[model samples]
Target: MRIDPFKLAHWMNARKYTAAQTADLAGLPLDDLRRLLGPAAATALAEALSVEPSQLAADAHRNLTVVHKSAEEMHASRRPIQRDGIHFYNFYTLAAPEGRVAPVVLDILCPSDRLPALNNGHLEPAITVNLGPGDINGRWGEEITPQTWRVLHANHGGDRWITGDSYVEPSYCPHSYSLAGDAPARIVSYTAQSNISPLMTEANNWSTGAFEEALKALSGKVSAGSVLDLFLARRAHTRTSAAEAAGVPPADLEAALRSPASETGLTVLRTLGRALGFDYRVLLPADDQHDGVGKTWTTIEDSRRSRRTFGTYEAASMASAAHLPDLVGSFLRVDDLIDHAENHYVVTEGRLTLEWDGPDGPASVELEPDGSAWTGPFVRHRWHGTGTVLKFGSGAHLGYQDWLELTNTFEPAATLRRGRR
Candidate 1:
């Protein structure tokens, strides 16, 4: 019966509760109880209290049933329970950490060409991605039949992947995908399988149509090759529903996705990010174009042509398509990292700002401007913006600019000599 101070105030005020009585009823400390009857509780205690919204303590809700039958009994003893064309299964993840590549699922459903009719079923909306040569072209599902379908497979040849794309689709259309590889395809696929419930709102979740409109609006506002921040923040402590996420304004989404180096797009995107509660950071090719197609930076090109043993393994490092003066620890920062203890980041679409413990005793943030280029802290440095530092190469060259978090658990005095014990 632990009530939130705000909830208790709201409830008590309507009932004409006095401070002393309110405290007694909610089991609050007598002296501190008057705050519950105060008006400022609305603003002061805005965060929702930690309590279950519903109480089913007295009722025996038998919501689950298990059917145990041997194969022989199941096949022979037949009192079939009639099912309404759809089937639902509940699942729990046994073991899958966030960063480690997940395992793929194999399907023995049927051959691809002679796919069966869906019978009003369609694939639930989902995403697709390609990992590497081990991965087949990508992991995705096909809706050849009317039924919503999803699949995971390791079908790529040995040749690793070079490009990646992701999208959502309507369940009604049948589509097949391939992972780009020539060696035995070994890929981790993400196929979100679900029954297309009758209660599902909108046709095919309107994902196909939504994407088309997204692209249309996108073309007018932004050019290609920009970074998109897919993860938006939720209202603090609020469980974001998928419906709310789907309704994210197309303009807002475009602004987040289309701007590479432009300040207009980046600013709008960062504002949206702050509203949603996530800080924003992005790296764009200097001219708002990818470093490819004879563009400026050649860092991405070197990584593309990289062989297995040709690079360093610090939190961040790169090989510049040659073995000359090997550039190790290129974008290494010299301040505390914000959240990552390891501060190791790979270039997903751009560069990385790594934070690691240096010989100077404590963590530091390092910026790898280009995957292939770097200037370590040994060179002269400059500082900027909250917690980032800018470094210069020789006296004349502006080498790179990366930042660090000075407040991140890094105390030079306490960390250095272990307190002389």
Candidate 2:
């Protein structure tokens, strides 16, 4: 039986099953379920996944083989790129074409013994090369659970002799690894750039595509790259001058421009949208049907289909906030928002809270009765308002504009409301 653990994980996530639930359904300890080592484990996992036990066993075996092969392939590609006696190798690269796309690359290393752990965003499908006899200690993602970690560690061979182990991780899952043993632990890794993160790897958004097309359209009309470069240089120069004055670290404009998946890229995309007179909209596809799960009711669907639900107010608020200045587009409909909000009678404790969904989480906010708003990220904004109003304010330090823009981008409802007399 050849089961891909990543695929199994993908299915579980798709169905929204927690590790504990999966383990209970499989009739095994979470450890055994996670490892999927023997025929018994496979059978249990298969039952949990609602498939034939033999098939699950076969797939599990196949998944291990794939990981081992990947390790070999990586090893074959290794070159002597070393620093400080620890060897490094660049095995893969993802380069963005033109100025519209971004690039990513992979690297491997054999670090010195007892080196301090380095923690960062480990983009997934990241394979951890387990040169056993050493401990690579770390947690995967937020709210690390033993059951989940057991599966992750098993995915990478969990203290067992294995050539390579693999992980299918969500983007920016906070992780840290430290090599501890008598010898340095050899390691291989994978990562991505652009929107190539695993979460977006399966889903398609026509809206993002349209935004990219807009960037391409404006490229000929304006020197898009030149304008972006000039803007970045000016910002960088400003940061440098300020840093010099205050003896603080200067901003790395080049790094930011190079990384299109970061805050910098989002900023550049929005800026170009404003410059080109196009708003980037987040439109969901009309096709909301999932193959296995019929008539899946998502948050978007809740907002769209159920007008009398609590989400109606949130949908309405999002629609209202979407009108803020410099926004290029949105997939949400104002009519839907109006229908949802108007259908429901809202009674507030002198405040209305709205949640804005994001890749990391939902950035939410509470609009107070006294023309003030508090954001999910804990930023306070006092704005002048009469009826429906969208306000933007600029302030000193990173708090003001960044917070406002974040609210504008992710949670537009924070500044949007109805029936404010």
Candidate 3:
């Protein structure tokens, strides 16, 4: 395994350990820690750092990523089919660092050929977009069973047509697309692996019953009480011991753990978090404001009207969800993007000439309609052209700032490791 020396160094610093200490933990010489090449060393060091080995792997995070894919590149990557000499799927020439957008363009040829039972769903959510110039008013094709397909068709006049539309589909919904046109309807999808992919990649190995239980387990797993249970167990603290440490009643802690749904109050939770050597937010669950609406559709008019100015340019919200504040989407008319988050952009109308500062000095790339670009985090970039761009990413997998929040909240803030262990 190739571990990034800089990242390893950072991890060491966060744990309040010197290079010598890290070497001792990894059972490697001081010099070997800097040039950590063996998989075994990486794994051992990762455990000491309380992280996964892959986090230390080389190029796990990308930098100054600016990609420009041409029409030819898109065509060359066409999904080849042997039966009936057909090709329907076209992949873009973009390299996502596991957590970024894995975009693909597809030509939906035969809706009738779709499975009578089109009930396949995945853990990763998706974004399907409308592509074209301002004059190009088109339909948004999406499926999520707000009503069944037959009912949806009746609701709309044969087909759902609009000028421009963006649709978001949740993780559990099996989706389909269609258009009634002269040829197969070509559509572009922008979605990310983000944290979900890494989770599923490992969780895929669970037994059938394990899978069944784990799916249901998520409902309660996100609450503060569940967090207390797991963290207390991980810290090897009994209920009485934890209550004594936090100066809270044993009964409150017991109630929190016993019935997570009731949510044992903030004052107790704060004391508990501090006592547990973490922050109150650490025990805080995901903010779920979802009304059980499985899918969302936004038209060009709706998006344009939603636009807000940012001094340099304007942007509007696209298909997105409330739970993931970091997993963002916007319809943009901007000249420059701040070097904060990793980004995936597709030009729907006109052109954009993007210039960025790279390690090899300044470089530029031009994108046209159906053209896409990916820029990794901290890449200084700006663009100018007839701009109708769709900008999206999981803010570089919630980026450094989000993760940094979890650190330093505990007392003796320099340490990243848990205390009382």
Candidate 4:
């Protein structure tokens, strides 16, 4: 394994452990622990760090290197305007790389009194160089707490340009960069994604809920070792059994579930939720009025909106009332609404319209091609549709986010719920 010494060092520091502390914990000599090469040493250090040895291997294999080039050195480089309204020179690009894994380096200049933050939803080990007059704050997880923000001062990397302030932040972590100095500040950052693509973790972030609830819901619905089975089945729509979903072995699944808060553990929980006919979303926890001890982030939602959409060449599914920028993606059929007796919908002007017999009277819903829906007072259900299909849902069941798929069939419903509201 070609683990970068800096990456391993940052991993240790991120966990708030020093080299000597980690070496003592692992019962290895300080030299072997510092020189983290070879399978045996990597495995031993990984165990002490409470991470998989493969993580170290992958980090080593990434072979990421960095540099501290100034504005003059990179004067010819063009910077892209990031989504958050910050502009930076892209020194290294991940858009089309030589390999599946590589480092993304960007040179940033933050003006005074401005705060630039990146809401990266995956784990990234980064080297942040405080090149000029400014400070950088790093926050982990969904909530940005006081302790999470560790300031990076100017000229922190005095002698060694290759080395800078290192951090190994996990998924859903946001790093806020604040220019605290009197003038504009500049920094060059080199960051690498985990071996396991952020896609799985991003997928898991779709929902937030306790795993115990999922376990209870699927208690009798699936067979032995079917938790992973259901997740893979729904994930691929073809892999129907644990054996078919060979990517994740039964033992690994068990271990992941056993530690639900870990990255892999949360993924397992998310897959289980999908298999149980529901999606999980992260919800902000109620603020602590007394400020004693409580989790700031919690997963509470289990149900979603029942709206469905059919577009030009694809279909969409959403569980809430939200505006869609455009309808250029495909939509797939959801099994729960498939062959459902109550679903009855139509399409016109590339828009979807759904009607159902409500307890009060005959009610209808309309959706625009842009995925914008018409909502009424006391009428919680909303929808957005296209000529391909009519999408409708009840307000009581869905969140604000929607997922899309590709489908050719149109299935409408009289009501999205089990019965009339």
Candidate 5:
């Protein structure tokens, strides 16, 4: 079978198991351990660890397990987040998986006349909706000050009153909620963090301060031009020097340095990346960046008017956008069997039916309001219901650039090879 020597060794090390010890755990001979991993050995070892064989593989792409939480099950956990003997919110987690985006519902508690003080904030980029009349006390910025804080009615807009108005808050934004006038209010939200966050956290054990310092030192120099300039400045490279190093004409090199990385072709960027000792993607600038408190608003009325049709299924845009994160959030009214190719979550507003590609044909389950499900990528599934469903997803894990990288790889030999032969 397949073997990733480094990963296998690391896995063993993590469990503090030696070859003999692992063999003892698996009830197998050390000589036949590798051989057995192909069949019985691997299966037994997996059982020893209480995980799937794929979980021990070199590169594991573990999708979230299929889930269908019925309306009755959603309220199973009524534990509210309390502070100083006051109940603030009854937080309910919904369909969240793939380790990136998570959806949630919060029932705000404001029986008192005054709003309770809240914690600073969290790190996930989130969009929250006020299910009813509410008030917001929010704060953001680098340094704390009176100017950075604002308190106001949650459903208020510049021009008109909005029903179920939603607001998008960038990472680390602090906000508190209260009743507009002792009214019952609930909040629904989707909070997504970059997938790299866990890796960054894992690196902390070995990376220490130098890793952070390096990024912090050049955080502002993210553009291809800026990064190229930084490296050239360090090496004292002029147009002639840099062009020669990258095996390109001085004029071409100059043009690339003046343009954004996305505008500069990857062929040239790859050449430059090699010469500059950086990945080509590292030079590619991000699309979404914010300096000021980035708060975007989406009203339910506006979203309804902007509905798009798909057969008998209808969808309307929410606070989500098609940019960097590319999390397309929307309100879906399913009448026909709507097939979804991308990985997604559907939270029901009423009794609904979810069908998936089963061993024989389509298999389905009925769900009620406050129910939800998270489907795997490209796993054909259809949703049909009488009430509205909130749908959010990305096009699988691979972005557009990932497709290019995968398709442009070398043939079977090198494509699947872990290392050079």
Candidate 6:
């Protein structure tokens, strides 16, 4: 994609913009912007949007711009952040016909937290081509995580940010800016993509849709059954009389008995299946099988197809994390399997800790909000190797798993590996 190189100070100085007031810099008709962007972007956006070109001109006021209803809600929903340390805001994009860009106020912003001074939000380098405006906004001091990125755009713009791998080639990267110490930096970023194309292949990898496909691929082919479908079915408790669902040969409900249907027998079945083909059932111990009834859970690697053949449970499955010990009972499912998860009341009860391995050594964390205010699936990172269990501790909790899932679009591997930048 072709990018426009404009100096920040120069743009702001010429516009004479301020923190409280908003301004429109791209002084062009919305139709002209769309025409400038071409059909693929403008037509689809036009069909979904009601705002016209005249309304999205360079001299238009950000507040005066007609925002798509959804866009208004998102901007309205953003909670005012008040934390002492470096905070990564939500990861969002610039898709609206028009967006507001704010000046980076050095005054009042905490020196350590002034993001503009660090780099004015430059994109990090991957092996591929370096397009200007391809960087994550920072908090003066701290490295940013995908979970912390934020965006607010019209529906068309929203679609762009949702695409993890879709690269937008333009002179300017569209996004609102937020400040660290004083007033929250906000922007209504608009963009003109002259050459960049959507990266659907790369986007699929980071989304649940890819997992859904992988689940379908396992159907009939998987000897242990689609662990993903089974877990999701039980988790969602979605009733389906689909033949495949019904055809799953009913497993003997007993274990540890003299009968061949017992634990030993089940082990033999799993082992036999593994020898014949890929059997996720074999990935778990015989006695600990959940019967896909109570809790639904999954691991990170299991969430992807790349390492689907690694651990005994080579693919990602929706099984309880705490029950992982039971699932793999006595098996080398993932030797040195570390847990880096937040407490999830729905997936599994009790306090769930995040685990991983780092240079300092194994980290284990058990995070519980001070009160009962916290609950359900959480967004925490998990890293591992042999014999490591690094994790994090609880603090003033933040957002929910949905937000975390939304931000999951920015997997470093998925983005950098595919040249998304």
lDDT leaderboard ranking: 5, 3, 4, 2, 1, 6
> What would the TM-scores of all predictions be?
0.26, 0.21, 0.67, 0.28, 0.70, 0.17
Summed over model 4, clashes come to 29
Q: Distance from true position, residue 78, model 6, in Å?
A: 12
Can you write out model 2's per-residue Cα lDDT over 52-171, one digit (the tens) per residue? 654433321111100011213323543555443454434431211123111122233433343322345543222233323343434453454553232112113321212223332334
Question: Best candidate per lDDT, number?
Answer: 5
Model 3 whole-model lDDT (C-alpha atoms): 0.60
Query: Candidate 2 regions off by >4 Å?
Result: 1-76, 80-124, 127-133, 139-169, 173-177, 188-421
lDDT of 1 at 390: 16
lDDT of each: 0.30, 0.34, 0.60, 0.39, 0.61, 0.28
Off by over 4 Å in 3: 1-3, 6-57, 60-64, 80-101, 111-119, 132-145, 148-163, 180-184, 203-222, 236-241, 249-264, 285-295, 395-421
Off by over 4 Å in 5: 1-36, 39-65, 96-102, 111-116, 133-163, 207-209, 229-240, 247-255, 261-282, 291-295, 321-326, 336-348, 359-361, 394-396, 399-404, 407-421
Angstrom error at residue 131, model 2: 4.4
- Off-target runs (Cα >4 Å) in candidate 1 are 1-22, 27-108, 116-125, 129-187, 191-421
Count clashes in each candidate, considering only residues at least 3 apart in sequence or on different chains: 37, 18, 0, 29, 1, 38
Please provide, for model 6 over 83-108, each residue's C-alpha lDDT reduced to its tens digit, 9 standing for 90 to 100.
24544333232112244321111112
lDDT agreement of model 1 with the native: 0.30
Number of the top-ranking candidate, with TM-score as the measure: 5
Q: Which residue ranges in model 6 land beyond 4 Å of their true spot? A: 1-261, 277-421
